[PDB]
Amino acid sequence: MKRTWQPNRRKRAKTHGFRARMRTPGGRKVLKRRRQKGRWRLTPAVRKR
Amino acid sequence: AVKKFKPYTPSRRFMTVADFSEITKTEPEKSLVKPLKKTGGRNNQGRITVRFRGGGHKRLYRIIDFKRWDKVGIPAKVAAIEYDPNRSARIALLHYVDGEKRYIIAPDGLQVGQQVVAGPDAPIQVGNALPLRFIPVGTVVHAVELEPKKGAKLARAAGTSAQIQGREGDYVILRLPSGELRKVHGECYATVGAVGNADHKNIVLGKAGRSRWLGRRPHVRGAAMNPVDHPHGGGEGRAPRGRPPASPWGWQTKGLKTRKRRKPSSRFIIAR
RNA sequence: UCGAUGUCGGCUCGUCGCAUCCUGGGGCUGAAGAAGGUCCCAAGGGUUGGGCUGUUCGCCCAUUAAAGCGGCACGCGAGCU
RNA sequence: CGAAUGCCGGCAUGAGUAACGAUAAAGAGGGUGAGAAUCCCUCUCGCCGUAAGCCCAAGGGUUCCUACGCAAUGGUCGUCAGCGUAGGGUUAGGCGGGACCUAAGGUGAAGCCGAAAGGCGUAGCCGAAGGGCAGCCGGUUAAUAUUCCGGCCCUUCCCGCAGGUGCGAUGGGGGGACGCUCUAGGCUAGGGGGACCGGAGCCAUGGACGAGCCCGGCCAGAAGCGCAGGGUGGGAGGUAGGCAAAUCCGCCUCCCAACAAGCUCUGCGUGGUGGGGAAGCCCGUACGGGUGACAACCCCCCGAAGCCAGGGAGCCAAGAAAAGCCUCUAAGCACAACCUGCGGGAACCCGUACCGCAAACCGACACAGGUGGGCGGGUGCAAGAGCACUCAGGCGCGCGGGAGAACCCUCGCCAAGGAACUCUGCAAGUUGGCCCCGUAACUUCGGGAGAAGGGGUGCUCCCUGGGGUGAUGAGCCCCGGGGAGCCGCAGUGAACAGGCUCUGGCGACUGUUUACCAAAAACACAGCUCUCUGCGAACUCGUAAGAGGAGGUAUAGGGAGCGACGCUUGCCCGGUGCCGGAAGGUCAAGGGGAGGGGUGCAAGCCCCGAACCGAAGCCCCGGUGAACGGCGGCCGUAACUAUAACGGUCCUAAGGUAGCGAAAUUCCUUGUCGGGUAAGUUCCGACCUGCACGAAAAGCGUAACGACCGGAGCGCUGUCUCGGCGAGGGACCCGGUGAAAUUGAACUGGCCGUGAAGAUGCGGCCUACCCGUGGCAGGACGAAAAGACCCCGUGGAGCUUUACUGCAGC
RNA sequence: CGAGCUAGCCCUGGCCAGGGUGAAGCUGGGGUGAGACCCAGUGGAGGCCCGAACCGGUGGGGGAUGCAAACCCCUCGGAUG
RNA sequence: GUGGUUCGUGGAGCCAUGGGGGAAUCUGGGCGGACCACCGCCUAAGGCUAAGUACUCCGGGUGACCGAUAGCGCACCAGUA
RNA sequence: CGCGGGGUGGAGCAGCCUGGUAGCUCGUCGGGCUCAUAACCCGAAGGUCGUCGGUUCAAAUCCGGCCCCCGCAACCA
RNA sequence: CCGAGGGUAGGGCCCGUGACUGGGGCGAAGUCGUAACAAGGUAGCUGUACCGGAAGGUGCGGCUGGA
RNA sequence: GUGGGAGAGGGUGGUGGAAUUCCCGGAGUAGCGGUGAAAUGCGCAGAUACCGGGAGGAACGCCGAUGGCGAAGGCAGCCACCUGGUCCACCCGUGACGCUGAGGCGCGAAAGCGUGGGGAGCAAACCGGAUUAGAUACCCGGGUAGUCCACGCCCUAAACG
Numbered sequence A: 001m002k003r004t005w006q007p008n009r010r011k012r013a014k015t016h017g018f019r020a021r022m023r024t025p026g027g028r029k030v031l032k033r034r035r036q037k038g039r040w041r042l043t044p045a046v047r048k049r
Numbered sequence B: 001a002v003k004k005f006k007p008y009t010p011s012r013r014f015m016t017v018a019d020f021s022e023i024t025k026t027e028p029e030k031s032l033v034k035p036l037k038k039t040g041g042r043n044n045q046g047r048i049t050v051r052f053r054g055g056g057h058k059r060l061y062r063i064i065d066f067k068r069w070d071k072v073g074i075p076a077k078v079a080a081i082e083y084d085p086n087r088s089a090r091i092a093l094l095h096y097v098d099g100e101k102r103y104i105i106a107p108d109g110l111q112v113g114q115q116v117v118a119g120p121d122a123p124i125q126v127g128n129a130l131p132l133r134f135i136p137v138g139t140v141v142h143a144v145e146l147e148p149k150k151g152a153k154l155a156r157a158a159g160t161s162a163q164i165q166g167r168e169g170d171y172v173i174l175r176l177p178s179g180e181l182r183k184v185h186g187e188c189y190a191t192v193g194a195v196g197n198a199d200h201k202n203i204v205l206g207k208a209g210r211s212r213w214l215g216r217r218p219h220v221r222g223a224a225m226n227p228v229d230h231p232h233g234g235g236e237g238r239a240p241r242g243r244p245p246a247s248p249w250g251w252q253t254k255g256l257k258t259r260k261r262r263k264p265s266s267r268f269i270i271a272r
Numbered sequence C: 001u002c003g004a005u006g007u008c009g010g011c012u013c014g015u016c017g018c019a020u021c022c023u024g025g026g027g028c029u030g031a032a033g034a035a036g037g038u039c040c041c042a043a044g045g046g047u048u049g050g051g052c053u054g055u056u057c058g059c060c061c062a063u064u065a066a067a068g069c070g071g072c073a074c075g076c077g078a079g080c081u
Numbered sequence D: 001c002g003a004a005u006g007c008c009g010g011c012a013u014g015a016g017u018a019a020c021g022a023u024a025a026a027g028a029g030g031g032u033g034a035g036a037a038u039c040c041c042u043c044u045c046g047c048c049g050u051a052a053g054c055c056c057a058a059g060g061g062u063u064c065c066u067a068c069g070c071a072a073u074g075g076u077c078g079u080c081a082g083c084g085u086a087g088g089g090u091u092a093g094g095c096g097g098g099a100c101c102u103a104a105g106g107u108g109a110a111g112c113c114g115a116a117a118g119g120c121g122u123a124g125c126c127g128a129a130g131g132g133c134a135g136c137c138g139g140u141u142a143a144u145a146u147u148c149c150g151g152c153c154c155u156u157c158c159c160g161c162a163g164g165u166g167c168g169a170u171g172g173g174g175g176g177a178c179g180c181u182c183u184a185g186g187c188u189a190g191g192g193g194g195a196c197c198g199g200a201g202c203c204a205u206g207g208a209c210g211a212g213c214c215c216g217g218c219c220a221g222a223a224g225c226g227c228a229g230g231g232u233g234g235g236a237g238g239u240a241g242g243c244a245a246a247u248c249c250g251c252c253u254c255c256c257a258a259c260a261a262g263c264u265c266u267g268c269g270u271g272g273u274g275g276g277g278a279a280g281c282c283c284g285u286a287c288g289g290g291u292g293a294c295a296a297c298c299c300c301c302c303g304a305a306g307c308c309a310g311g312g313a314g315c316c317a318a319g320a321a322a323a324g325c326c327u328c329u330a331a332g333c334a335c336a337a338c339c340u341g342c343g344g345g346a347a348c349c350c351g352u353a354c355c356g357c358a359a360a361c362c363g364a365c366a367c368a369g370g371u372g373g374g375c376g377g378g379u380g381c382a383a384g385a386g387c388a389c390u391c392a393g394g395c396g397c398g399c400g401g402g403a404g405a406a407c408c409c410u411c412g413c414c415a416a417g418g419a420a421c422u423c424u425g426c427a428a429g430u431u432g433g434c435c436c437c438g439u440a441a442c443u444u445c446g447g448g449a450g451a452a453g454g455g456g457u458g459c460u461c462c463c464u465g466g467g468g469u470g471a472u473g474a475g476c477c478c479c480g481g482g483g484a485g486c487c488g489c490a491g492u493g494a495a496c497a498g499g500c501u502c503u504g505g506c507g508a509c510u511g512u513u514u515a516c517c518a519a520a521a522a523c524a525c526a527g528c529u530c531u532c533u534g535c536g537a538a539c540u541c542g543u544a545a546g547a548g549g550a551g552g553u554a555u556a557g558g559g560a561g562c563g564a565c566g567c568u569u570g571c572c573c574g575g576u577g578c579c580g581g582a583a584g585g586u587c588a589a590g591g592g593g594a595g596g597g598g599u600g601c602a603a604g605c606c607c608c609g610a611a612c613c614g615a616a617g618c619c620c621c622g623g624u625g626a627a628c629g630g631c632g633g634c635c636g637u638a639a640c641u642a643u644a645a646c647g648g649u650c651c652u653a654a655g656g657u658a659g660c661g662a663a664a665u666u667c668c669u670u671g672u673c674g675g676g677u678a679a680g681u682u683c684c685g686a687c688c689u690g691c692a693c694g695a696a697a698a699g700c701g702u703a704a705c706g707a708c709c710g711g712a713g714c715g716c717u718g719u720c721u722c723g724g725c726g727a728g729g730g731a732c733c734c735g736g737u738g739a740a741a742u743u744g745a746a747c748u749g750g751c752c753g754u755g756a757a758g759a760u761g762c763g764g765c766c767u768a769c770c771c772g773u774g775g776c777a778g779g780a781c782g783a784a785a786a787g788a789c790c791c792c793g794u795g796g797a798g799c800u801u802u803a804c805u806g807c808a809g810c
Numbered sequence E: 001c002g003a004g005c006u007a008g009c010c011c012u013g014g015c016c017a018g019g020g021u022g023a024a025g026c027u028g029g030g031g032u033g034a035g036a037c038c039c040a041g042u043g044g045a046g047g048c049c050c051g052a053a054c055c056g057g058u059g060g061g062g063g064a065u066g067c068a069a070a071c072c073c074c075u076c077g078g079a080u081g
Numbered sequence F: 001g002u003g004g005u006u007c008g009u010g011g012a013g014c015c016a017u018g019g020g021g022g023a024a025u026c027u028g029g030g031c032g033g034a035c036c037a038c039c040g041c042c043u044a045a046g047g048c049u050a051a052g053u054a055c056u057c058c059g060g061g062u063g064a065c066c067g068a069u070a071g072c073g074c075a076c077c078a079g080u081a
Numbered sequence G: 001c002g003c004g005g006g007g008u009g010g011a012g013c014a015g016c017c018u019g020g021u022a023g024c025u026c027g028u029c030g031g032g033c034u035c036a037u038a039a040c041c042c043g044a045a046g047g048u049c050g051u052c053g054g055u056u057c058a059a060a061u062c063c064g065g066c067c068c069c070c071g072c073a074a075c076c077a
Numbered sequence H: 001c002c003g004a005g006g007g008u009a010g011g012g013c014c015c016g017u018g019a020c021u022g023g024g025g026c027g028a029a030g031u032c033g034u035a036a037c038a039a040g041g042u043a044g045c046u047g048u049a050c051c052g053g054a055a056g057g058u059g060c061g062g063c064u065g066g067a
Numbered sequence I: 001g002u003g004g005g006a007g008a009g010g011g012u013g014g015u016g017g018a019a020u021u022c023c024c025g026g027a028g029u030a031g032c033g034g035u036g037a038a039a040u041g042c043g044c045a046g047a048u049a050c051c052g053g054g055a056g057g058a059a060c061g062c063c064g065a066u067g068g069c070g071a072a073g074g075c076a077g078c079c080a081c082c083u084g085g086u087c088c089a090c091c092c093g094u095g096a097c098g099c100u101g102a103g104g105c106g107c108g109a110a111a112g113c114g115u116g117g118g119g120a121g122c123a124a125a126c127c128g129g130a131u132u133a134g135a136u137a138c139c140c141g142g143g144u145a146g147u148c149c150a151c152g153c154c155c156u157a158a159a160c161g
């Protein structure tokens, strides 16, 4: 059947990107938490040009 | 007149379509004056706030003239009468000698080629606009302003009118389509005649689809729902209500008057 | 037995009891004969197909030597429905 | 630490067991190699071919090509690979995206709001498979190519010269600019045929040296032509409108056109030139190379859904925007600037490999699943993207070899009977395409209809009628008619392709739904009615601003119910709701202070506090049922009995009307009559004693409709009497890889007892050598889920109301 | 933190082979005082019909440590809304 | 009308304040728990002010703290696979 | 089986809960009006309060047990 | 080829019969009430419409076969 | 043909006054309505009667007759338009062109029906209050369809002279 993962680079970027997270206090805290944690990747790596 | 069909299909046996014979050879509209992009959307910034809206034909807005006092004294020739997707009535395309082209909402009896004009001057004829004062008591009228210089707001639906009843210092009394008795300021413009397309009420949609074409989504009964959804939801195999009939939001829907009492508008109203 | 013993009926497959439906043997009969009645002995084999109902059971239809009664977790769902 | 269905790890059992992932299928010869069913090569065979073939887009991210490798990854093997190591590979002014434009939506200077965080927000900005915009055909790499190279052709900028003109904006106008169905004319893509042109070759096995077989007979292409077609009126006055101004546009008014005549604009033919160019044969490949070749490259026919394109006609549901572009003027500037021609120079950034219906994407897997767009040949069957075969092209699905038991799956056939099967004709059969006869009740006049029931269907010859393309003909292609005759069991000879009827219930109808057990009689639906709402509407969302409603205005918007249509929808306003009542009773803060209290020597200061004045709400007075709802009891009576039109009496707010009724409602119940049957708890018709119908939670009907549900009959059958045989995939045996839930340990029989009441384990007796393999399922109260029923816990949640108490809202 | 699954709406695009049935309206004839209306022929409507693609998910069988945490087979609904 | 304090409306002051009313400048004003008298204590409606106090990302010292299932999640290129 | 409501002149009903008094409508009987019947008018009659118990000074009335009558309930399996 | 007839399927008309139902006629002395004929005690009749055990009543228009 | 005449003959558009009902303002009180008699009902929340204003529908008093007009049904305030029939005079034109009329076709009171509008008065059904043995009637107080208009049906009558 159709499963739940339907990859889209634009969506992944607009949805979970560094700039989206930065836009709101909710998201800014996510970066803070991930930084303090020592996460190698703050936001998902969306590729291609 | 109303177009009628033979039952060559079920739902074609009741279906019924407007007569478009008053639609003069001018079916597609007029750029310049109108159209605008019209912005379909069944809801506010976010959430739906009027249920069951959506779908249905794309539209172009015809930006019509609801304040006729710009062109006081300037007459215009009625050039055409065309279909307007965004109202029950039809619209008149008129050419002002000025050059300017406006649409007026098209009254019953309006003929193409006719002369029409607005102002204190203005022969009392079908199509003309006047401040309510100079209009003879008892004449039927439409596109009436509520307060002066604020635009036509009463009687624009197809086949509607108001009748002038009497006067009272600065106000003339109106009898509105609903039957209400209203004091409306003398200085309010209103155009003589009834609205026309009066056979609009006689049309039978005929099937579900037609409803959808006009963007009317299926309306579901409270009875059909559940207690979470509606006061009428549940219980077992059908149910008669079990309380005084209500809206989904709990207010009673048979009888409960809802106009706020202390409206300052009150001292200008005399009926139902 | 509730940290589960699947629960009616049917179908398939049986097997057992006898307080026997038939067939065998028998006494009494209000047993002339034929046919019955009723009691004792006896389970070795047999104990039909259909209409109706989920039905068990029953009521019908047409037959029959007869169209027996019960138990086996109201036998039988790691066998089926 | 011995237990916690404990936690982590390790190793057993089940076990050499089940499986090895579509039943599209393999066989052989030769290579290579330490080692081949599994890798390369050749021959034969099979499968796909509206794909299982080609090309995009997304997603993936080196998987591309090559050399060397086989520990692991591959359900076996592997010399192989999408795997390991290394090296190489992605080339653009013209393709896509960006230095262009706007859509929803986002953001958001002005502004508005919000305890904070933040929420809104006309301008602008961002935002795209939509608008705009200039490259076609061939050749080269092991791997890129509309990117490199060849030929042919274009686009912007910048600077020159030469000729034109009042040039000139983010401002004005125009255009861009638009639906759905159906479509004409002419083209092109693509396809068929050819006695004609071009080709290596080939006469087999009885015949054929033949207008024989086989293979192929094209592509691109500036200007100029030609053919189709699309857009467009030209003057001159006047002007008060297009938010400044215009010569532009708009609106008047006169002339000439009304035609596409003329201007332009596309498409298609043709075109200077450029390029491609089979079968076969020969070569060595993992494949391509050569020859065929000076290859030929011509004539008919079919022909789009694509092109001309903004074509035409019809309809109602009435069908983006902005820039580019044309034009008009404003400031400015007119030695500027802008337009046309020609030259020279300038022309950035990112993508480009490969996969791409799939072993490279989404599903933990080389997973029978899911994945948007374009091309998608031929023949036949009425047509088609259907079906059978088959070009090109791609595959035989990464375990095999035997065997020929039970049983399972999928499939084929069956004497006689044919629903006797069963909850049920569940399943399976019958029927099936096309042409022609022919069709009932009923009906809303459309239908019911494919009703039903029939007949025809191949091939050959003779005669003959219409078109189409050609010229008014031959051909080539479409549709017809008539007449003889031939063969077989059978002519839509294969594949694809309704079983029919009668009668009930429900729902009018097409639709919709519980993604993953319910598709329905449930939801929706046109339509009917009630009620709210005069517009800063009612209502909804939000603390607010604000927004939806709606750029709508009572023929409109919201809410409720009923639910096509027909005929209709009775009585009750006592209680509850809602509606209406400037009277009265009650009624809070507040006003008011008769009167009283506490302290002070006092002036004072501080307390309580009755009259009376005080809203809404409640009370009370009315209305209102397509508002919440409700719509009786007991006795008696007629000249046979029986029954009761008729009467009495009690109570109510009134005491269910019409229509229907053993019902999707009937307990007693398989009611009682009638019908279908040999037989009928079901079904249909009636009766009415309606436990417990009944009128918009509508009542009673209704043609048509339905993967609904009931009853019947015909037809047909392996459903059954009652089975039998055959087929293939498994099951079985051999080689290779090799799981699982479960498991206190086990050296694990029957009976009658007994035991916490159902014993392999206890007693007595009976039976019984040790160990496996295929099978069957009675038992181990077998496995699986800390029972989902039941109860319990002063456990929890969703729901409700005239439960309590609050809050929003009013 | 999620509408990259699912539900609705918004904006912009795409798709729907081939066959049937034959409404209105046109045109001619008929009819009448003029009409209605009736015959043709033309026309090409429709939540119209058969049937692929496509969207479904009706009944039965299989599957049930599956090919698959919803699949496969035969059958079946819709297919210009 | 509320919050603060031990103070939950209590005899409920004190301290803050959303609403309404609304003064005075030393013979002015607040407080000492309703209030009044007395006796006293303070000088509101402007602001700043080290130190003593809190913590431990980081450096160091020490342990009747651990010793790879322990000790931090990580002794090991771990907020990684 | 369980529950709660009821039996009162000839008929249908009041009378009880706060025990002492059985009332209404009809019907029945006698008398009138009328030619006659009904209607109407004037008089009058009629009840072991279902039965067995006791409670009290006194029971239709209050409390127990049977007797018919009506009404409801009988759910989860 | 035709063709008696037989067979299959579907229609038309007619006759018989059917639980049950509808109204009708007829049958000396059963029940209810009084609608009509006198002005019938509400003038009657009437087409229609609704209602009622029943005759009937009422609405609307009409008639004289009444005043 | 020519020239005249009377008429509620038909259709459309417009208009006038009286009266009833409801609303508003004033003034005004204790009863009004109704009947055989009553009651229901309305009224101190201010009824009835009286004056002022406004709204809305329907029917047109006097003239009016025992009258006129039409084929009947039927037609009545007034005005204008459109329009049918018809009588007289003159004897001017045609020249037998006539009468009737199965069928057909049109028209056709009232009630009724569909769709929409309208709704003052009246009023089937219905609710009450009296009458009666009873009253599903007659009288009385309410009251909805309908009565009014547009368009489409229906086709009946004591459609009677």
Ligand SMILES: NC[C@@H]1O[C@H](O[C@H]2[C@@H](O)[C@H](O[C@@H]3[C@@H](O)[C@H](N)C[C@H](N)[C@H]3O[C@H]3O[C@H](CO)[C@@H](O)[C@H](O)[C@H]3N)O[C@@H]2CO)[C@H](N)[C@@H](O)[C@@H]1O
Pocket (backbone or CB within 6 Å): H027, H030
């Ligand atoms: N022939 C009379 C027709 O039927 C009806 O009349 C019928 C009934 O009304 C009538 O019934 C009458 C009754 O009215 C009257 N008041 C009492 C009488 N005893 C009855 O009588 C009936 O029954 C008896 C006995 O059985 C018979 O002998 C007698 O013939 C018969 N008429 O009996 C008639 C049938 O015989 C219509 N009313 C009348 O208009 C119609 O024309």
Ligand SMILES: [Mg+2]
Pocket (backbone or CB within 6 Å): B031, B032
């Ligand atoms: Mg525009």
Ligand SMILES: [Mg+2]
Pocket (backbone or CB within 6 Å): B044, B045, B046, B047, D541, D542
């Ligand atoms: Mg919002």
Ligand SMILES: [Mg+2]
Pocket (backbone or CB within 6 Å): none
């Ligand atoms: Mg937002």
Ligand SMILES: [Mg+2]
Pocket (backbone or CB within 6 Å): B219, B220, B221
């Ligand atoms: Mg609904």
Ligand SMILES: [Mg+2]
Pocket (backbone or CB within 6 Å): B224, B225, B226
């Ligand atoms: Mg529900």
Ligand SMILES: [Mg+2]
Pocket (backbone or CB within 6 Å): B227, B228, B230, B231
């Ligand atoms: Mg609720």
Ligand SMILES: [Mg+2]
Pocket (backbone or CB within 6 Å): B236, B237, B238
């Ligand atoms: Mg129910």
Ligand SMILES: [Mg+2]
Pocket (backbone or CB within 6 Å): B231, B232, B233, B234, B235, B239, B240, B241, B242
């Ligand atoms: Mg409910």
Ligand SMILES: [Mg+2]
Pocket (backbone or CB within 6 Å): C001, C002
């Ligand atoms: Mg248990």
Ligand SMILES: [Mg+2]
Pocket (backbone or CB within 6 Å): none
């Ligand atoms: Mg256990």
Ligand SMILES: [Mg+2]
Pocket (backbone or CB within 6 Å): none
């Ligand atoms: Mg178990």
Ligand SMILES: [Mg+2]
Pocket (backbone or CB within 6 Å): none
């Ligand atoms: Mg014995």
Ligand SMILES: [Mg+2]
Pocket (backbone or CB within 6 Å): none
């Ligand atoms: Mg004997």
Ligand SMILES: [Mg+2]
Pocket (backbone or CB within 6 Å): none
């Ligand atoms: Mg049968």
Ligand SMILES: [Mg+2]
Pocket (backbone or CB within 6 Å): none
């Ligand atoms: Mg037995």
